[PDB]
Paper text:
Interferon-inducible protein 16 (IFI16) is a member of absent-in-melanoma-2 (AIM2)-like receptors (ALRs), which contain a PYD and one or two nucleic acid-binding HIN200 domains (hematopoietic interferon-inducible nuclear antigen with 200 a.a.). IFI16 acts as a versatile innate immune sensor that detects dysregulated nucleic acids, with its most prominent mechanism of action being assembling filaments on unchromatinized double-stranded (ds)DNA.
The average power spectrum from cryo-EM images of 256-pixel-long nonoverlapping filament segments showed that the IFI16PYD filament is a three-start helix with 134.6° rotation and 5.6 Å rise, displaying no rotational symmetry. As a consequence, the diameters of both outer and inner rims of the IFI16PYD filament are smaller than those of the ASCPYD filament. For instance, compared to ASCPYD, the short helix 3 that mediates the Type 3 interface protrudes from the center of the protein by ~ 6 Å in IFI16PYD (dotted red circle in Fig. 2Dc).
Residue numbers in the entry:
A (entry chain R), B (entry chain N), C (entry chain J), D (entry chain D), E (entry chain H), F (entry chain P), ...: 4 to 89
The structure:
C-alpha cells in the first residue's frame, strides 16, 4: 500500500509547481523524456514510481526531495510518519 | 446490491481524473496490467471489483480511497451512509 | 405488453454505455456469465428479463436502475408514466 | 393480400436487428418458443402472423411496433399508407 | 408456353429463400396447406399455378411479386419482356 | 370414417418432418421396427393405426401429439372439430 | 434412330429433378394427366415423345427446353451435335 | 412415454445451435460417428437415445446437459417437472 | 472384402457433404455423368468403385481423397489401418 | 430354421437402404450380376443365401455385415442371440 | 486431377466470405444467375469450373483471384506450387 | 473484368467505415433500402453495382467517391491506373 | 447528389467536437433521442438528414449551422459554392 | 431554435473560465454532480439546458448570469437581441 | 465426460473475442487452416479437441490458455476445480 | 508456442494505442493495407505474424518494437525472459 | 525502417504541444483538413508521412522542423544520428 | 513555407505578453471572439492567419506589428530577412 501514500498524501497535496519540480528531479531516476516531463500527471507518475521503485514505491526518494524543499518539510515529516505506520 | 452502490453512487459521480486515480490505486488489488490501466471503464472496473471483492464488492476499499481524497470526502460519507442503509 | 415498454422505450433509447451499465447491474439478477456481459444485445437482454422478471418484465428494476443514473432521470420518469398507463 | 404488405414492404425492408426485435416483441402474441425466436425468418414469421392474426395478417401490430422505433417511423407511415390503399 | 416462362426464367433464377417467400405469398392464391408450403418444389408450384391461374399461368402474379422484391426487380423486368415477346 | 379424418385431414396435411416425428412418437404404440419407422408412408401408418387403435383409429393420440407441437396446434384444433363433428 | 438420342443421350443423362422439369413443361404438348406426369419414367416419356412428335421424336423441343436450363446447356449443345450428325 | 417428452418438450424447443451442442455432448453416449454428428436430426437423435437409454429415454442425461446451459435452465426445470409428472 | 472397407468404414462414415466431394472428385475416374453425380448414393458409388477399380476396390484413391480433407484425416488413417489388416 | 432368422428377424427388419447395402456387400459372395443387384428382394436374397451358404444360411456373414453398420448393431446383437438360441 | 487441387486445396481452405467473393468474381466466367450465386457450394462450383474451364479446371483463374486477396496470398502460392507439381 | 478491380482493389481495401460511407452515398444510385444499407457486404455491393452500372461496373463512380475522401485519394489514383490498364 | 456534399465536403471535414455540435443542434430537427446523439456517426447522421430533409439533404441547415461557428465559416462558404455548383 | 442561440452565440463565445463559471452557477439548476462539473462541455451543457429548461432552453438564465459578469455584458446584450429576434 | 466441462463450462462461457483467441492459439495444435479459424464454433472446436486431445479432451490446454488471460483466470480456476472433481 | 507469448504476454498486455503503434510499424513487414490498419485486432495480427514470421512468430520484432517504447520497456524485458525460457 | 524512427524517436518523444505544431507545419505537405488538424494522433500522422513522403518517411522534414524548435534541437540531432545509422 | 517562418521564427520566440498583444492587435483582422482572445495559442493563431492571410500567411502584418514594439524590432528585422530569403 505504498502507492496509496505517495499518491494521496504525497504528490496530490503539493501544488502544480512542486509536482513539476518533483518530475524534473526524478526525470533521470524514472527515464522521463520530453513528452513525459510535461504530459504525465500525478497518477501516471505514481504508477511509474511503483513500476521502477518497487522497494518503497518511490516514497523514500519523494521524502528526500521534499526535505530539500522548505515549503514541503511538514509534508515530508507527515510522509515519514505514514511510512513508519505502514 | 453493493455493486449498484459502487457503480452508480461511486465511480460514476467521480470525474475521469479520480476514476484513473482509483484504477491506479486498486491496480495491485485487482491485478490490472498495462492495458487495463487505461482501457477499462467504470462499468468493467465495478464488475471486476465485484468479481474479486465479493465480501463488499469493493465498496469498503473505494470508501477508504475516497477518504484520502479531499475533493471526494463528502462522496465517501455518502457511500458510508448508503452502505449502512444496505 | 411490459416488454414492449422496456425494449422500445427502454434499452433502445439509452446508448451502448448505459446499456452495458444495465447489463452489469442486472448480472446477478439475470445470471449473466462472462459471455452474456459482452455479447447479449438489447433484444436478448429484454427477453431474458421477461423470462426471469415475469411480474413486470424487468421494467420496474430498469426504472430503479435509471433513477440512479443522472443522465436517464427523464427516461426513468417516462418509463414510470408508461407503466402507469399500462 | 395483407400478408404481401407485411412481408415485402414490412419485415423485408427492416434489417436483421429490427427483425429480431420484432420477433421478440411478438413472441407472446405468436407463442414463439426458444427455437422460433432464433430460427424463424421473415417468411415463416409473416406466415405465422397471418395464421394467428387473421383480422389484418399482423400488419396493424407491425405498424404499432414500428411506431415506437425511431428508425422505422417512415416505414410505419408507408405501411399505414399501404393499408389505407388496400 | 406460359409455364415455360414461370419455371425457367422465373422460379429457377431465384434462390431458395425467394422461392419460399413466393410460395408463402401465393399460399392463399394456390390453397397451399402446411405440407405444400415447405414440400412442393418449383416444378410442382409452377404446375399448380398453371392449374389454378390458367389465364396467365401465374406469370402476371409472379411478376407482381417480383416487383416488390428489390433484389428481383431486374428479373421482373425480364419476365415482362418475355411475356410481351410471347 | 375416423380413418378419413386422420389421413386426409391429418397426416396428409403435415410435412415429411412432422410425419417422421409422428411415426417416431408412435413407434412404441404401433410396434414399428427399423423398416416400418423409416419406410411406411402416411397411408400405411393410418391403416396400421386403424388396425391397432380401433377405439378411435388413432385420432385421439394424433391429436395429443399435434397439441404439443406448436406448428401443428391449429391442425390439432381442426382435428378436434372434425372429431366432434363425427 | 431419333429415340436413341432423346433417350440414351437425353433424358437418361439428366437427374430426376430435371426430368421432372421436362415432364412438367411438355405436359401440355404430351397430354400428361395427373398420373402420367408423376409416374411415367424416361423410357415411357421418350416413347410418348416419338408417338406424338414424329417430326423429330421430341429432340427439338427437348433441346429447346435444355437451352433455358443453365445446368444443361452443355447437354443441349451435345444434343444439337447429335442431331446434326443424324 | 419418456420419448414423448424428450422430443416435443426437449430437442425441438431448443434451437439448432443447442441441438448440435447436445449431439456433440452425447456423441460418446450414443456412438455417433462423423456422419451422424451433423446428419441426424431431432427425431432420429431422440429415437437413438430411446434405443440406447431405455431406462429414461435419455431424459435424465438431457436434463443434466440443459442444466449447465444457462439459456436452457428454465427448459431443464420444465423437463424435470414433466418427468415428475410421468 | 475390400468393398466392406470402402463402404462401411468409408462412404458410410462421412456425411453428405464429404460424400458429394467424393462423388465429385471421382467423376472423371468413374465416368459419372450429370445424373450419376447427384443421383448415385453410397451403395451404387461403392459398387462402381469395385467395378472400375478392381485393383483395390477404390480404397487407395478414397484414402488419397480423404488425406487432403482435414476433417477426414483420422478416417483416412483408419482406412489405411483396415487396408493393412486386410 | 436358419433361414427364418436371416429372413424374418434379418433382412425384413432392416430398411431398403440397408438391404441394398447387404445386397452390394454380398454380391461377390452370392454371384449377383447386374439384374440380381437391383431386382432380387429379401425373400430371394435369403433363398440364395441358403442355397450358397449352407453352413449357417448366411446368418454369420449377415451378422458380420450388421456389426459394421452403426444403425444395425442392436439388430446384429439380436441375430447373435437368435443364433445361440438355435 | 486439376479439380483435386482447385477443390481440396482451393475453395475448401478459404472461408465462406472468400468463397462468396470467388463465386462473385467468377459469375461472368461461369454464367451464375441469382440462384447459383447464393446456392452453389464448393463442390458444384468446382465442377462447373472444370466443365467450363477444361484447360486447367479453373486453377489458373482461382490463383489469379487469390493473388489479389491479401489474406489468401499464401494459399495462392501453395496452389501455384501444386500446379507446378502436377 | 471491371468487377474484379472494384471488389479487390476497391471495397476490400477500404475499412468498414469507408465501406459504410460508400454504401450510403450509392444508396440512391443502387436503390438500397433500409436492410441493404446495414446488411449488404462488399461482395453483394459489388455485384449490385455491376448489375446496375454495367457500363463500368461502378468503378468510375467508386473513383469519384474516393476522390472526395482525403484518406482514399491514393486508392482512387490506384483505381484510375487499374482502369487505364484495363 | 446533395448528400455527397453534406457528407464528404461537410461532416467529414469537421472534427468530432463540431460533429457533436451538428448532432446536438439538429437533434430537434432530426428527432435524435439520447442514444442517437452519442451513437450516430457522420454516415448515419447524413442519411437521416437526407431522409428527413429531402428538399436539400440537410445541406442548407448544415450551412446555416456552420455560419455561426467562427472556425467553420470557410467550410460554410465552400458548401455554399458546392450547392451553387449543384 | 433557442438551443442554437445558447450554444453557437452563447457558451461558444465565452472562454473556458467563463464556461466553468456558468456550469458552477447552474449546478443546482441542472443537477450537475462532480463528474458533470469537470467533464461536461458546452454541447452537453446546452443539451441539458434544453432538456431541463424547455421554456427558453436556458437562454434567460444564461443572460442573467452574463449580466453579473462585467466581461460578458456585451454578449448578454447580444443574446437579448437574438432572443427578441427569435 | 471431459468434453462436457470444456464445452459447457469452457468455451460457452467465454465471449467471441476469447473464443477467437482460443481458436488461434490452438491452430497449430488442432491443424486449423484458414477456413477453420474463422468458421468453427464452440461445438465443433470442442469436438476437434476431443478427437485430437484424447488424453484430456483439450481441457488441460484450455486451462493453460485461460491462465494467461487475466479476464478468464477465475474461469481457469473453475475448470481446474471441475477437472479435480472428475 | 511462440505465438502464445506474442499474443498473451504481448499484444494483450498493451493497450489500444500501443497496439495501433505495433500494427503501424509492422505494416510494411506484414503487408497491411488500409483496411488491415484499422480492422485487424490482436488475434488476427498475431496470426499474421505467425504466418509471415515463422522464424520467431513475430516475437523478436515485437521485442525490438517494445524496446523503443519507453512505457513498454518492462514488457519488452518480460518478453525477452519468456523467449529465453522457451 | 524510417517510420520506426519518425514514430518512436520522433513524434512520441515530443509533447502534445510540439506534436500539434508538427501537424500544423506539415498540414500543407500532408493535405490535412480541419478534422485531421485536431483528430489525427502520432500513429496516423506518421503513417500519412510514410504514404506521402516515401523518400524518407518524412524524417528529413521532421528534422528540419525540429531544427527551428529550440527545445527539440537535441532531438533533431538524435534523429540525424538515427538517419545516418540507418 | 511562410507559416514555418511566422510560427517558428515568429510567435514561438516572443513571450506570452507579446503574443497576447499580437492576438489583440490582429483580432479585427482575424475575427477572434472572446473565446479566441485567450484560448487560442501560437499554433492555432498561425493556422488561422494562414487561412485568412493566404497572401503571405500573416508574415507581413506580424512584421508590421513587431515594428511598433521596441523590444521585438530585432525579431522584426530577422523576419524580414527570412521573408527575403523565402
Amino acid at each position: 500500500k505504498y502507492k496509496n501514500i505517495v499518491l494521496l498524501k504525497g504528490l496530490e497535496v503539493i501544488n502544480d509547481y512542486h509536482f513539476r519540480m518533483v518530475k524534473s528531479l526524478l526525470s533521470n531516476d524514472l527515464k522521463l523524456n520530453l513528452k513525459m516531463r510535461e504530459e504525465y500527471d500525478k497518477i501516471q507518475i505514481a504508477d511509474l514510481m511503483e513500476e521502477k521503485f518497487r522497494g518503497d514505491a518511490g516514497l523514500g526518494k519523494l521524502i528526500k526531495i521534499f526535505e530539500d524543499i522548505p515549503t514541503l518539510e511538514d509534508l515530508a515529516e507527515t510522509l515519514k510518519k505514514e511510512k513508519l505506520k505502514v
